[PDB]
Amino acid sequence: MGSSHHHHHHSSGLVPRGSHMKTVEVNGVKYDFDNPEQAREMAERIAKSLGLQVRLEGDTFKIE
Numbered sequence: 001m002g003s004s005h006h007h008h009h010h011s012s013g014l015v016p017r018g019s020h021m022k023t024v025e026v027n028g029v030k031y032d033f034d035n036p037e038q039a040r041e042m043a044e045r046i047a048k049s050l051g052l053q054v055r056l057e058g059d060t061f062k063i064e
Contacts, residue, residue, distance in 0.1 A: 004034070019059055026052070026063035 011018070022036035024043040027050070033039035036059075043054040043061040052063045 022059040022061065024054075024061040024063065026050070028064075030060070 021032045022039055024031045024033070024039050024046070026043070026046050031039075031042075033042065040054075040056075040061060043056075043063055046052070047054045047063050050063070055062045055064060
C-alpha cells in the first residue's frame with residue numbers, strides 16, 4: 001500500500017495551527033515532500049543547479 005498520506009479524519013494534538021505542508025516552489029512549480037527537512041536540502045540542491053536562490057516565504061521554499 002502507498003497510503004502514506006492523511007487518511008485519519010480526527011484533528012487532534014490540541015488542534016494546532018493546521019497550515020499547508022512546507023512546499024518547495026521552484027520556477028513557480030510547487031513540490032511537496034515526505035519530510036520538510038528533506039524538502040529544504042532538495043531545495044538548496046535545485047538552487048545551485050539552476051543558479052537560482054531558495055527564498056522560503058512562509059512555508060513555501062520559493063526557488064527564484
